Amino acid sequence: GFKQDIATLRGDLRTYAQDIFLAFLNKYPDEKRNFKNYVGKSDQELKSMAKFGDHTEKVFNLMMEVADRATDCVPLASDASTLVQMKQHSGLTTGNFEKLFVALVEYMRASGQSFDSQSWDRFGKNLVSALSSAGMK
Ligand code: HEM
């Protein structure tokens, strides 16, 4: 289930973090409006860009903590408030999060592994609801 999936992702987190973020950028290329330095790069070129690797790992490190602190895929209100109030998120709306979770779930469904894709779909929807209640547009 969901808690085992957190353990699976954490066991290879740099690889999962990069491949999920690339699945997102490749599914929604207009999302590079928020990542202008990632334009005109293949996946292999992005992986060899220092900030791409370091920011994607730090995003997925925190995402796994938010997932781990969740009850039945419902994140803590404190984690939603933190995500809304981060200066690095000043540009964002809940639709950016929705797209990330649509890409993550499709990535999981395409994997050979027994990921609980329906729990990740719930988690993404519940995080979006929590972000809106914490003040994200
Ligand atoms: C649960 C989901 C997410 C978590 C846990 C999260 C977490 C973080 C963290 C920890 C940072 C600091 C990274 C660093 O400076 O090294 C960060 C920066 C950032 N996050 Fe988020 N994030 C999430 C979703 C998103 C989404 C959906 C977007 C846009 C589609 C986004 C855009 C950014 C941007 C633009 C930065 C600053 C630019 C950059 O670091 O390259 N994040 N995020």
Ligand SMILES: Cc1cc(Cl)ccc1O
């Ligand atoms: C800044 C950032 C955002 C997301 Cl959603 C994924 C990876 C990253 O490096």
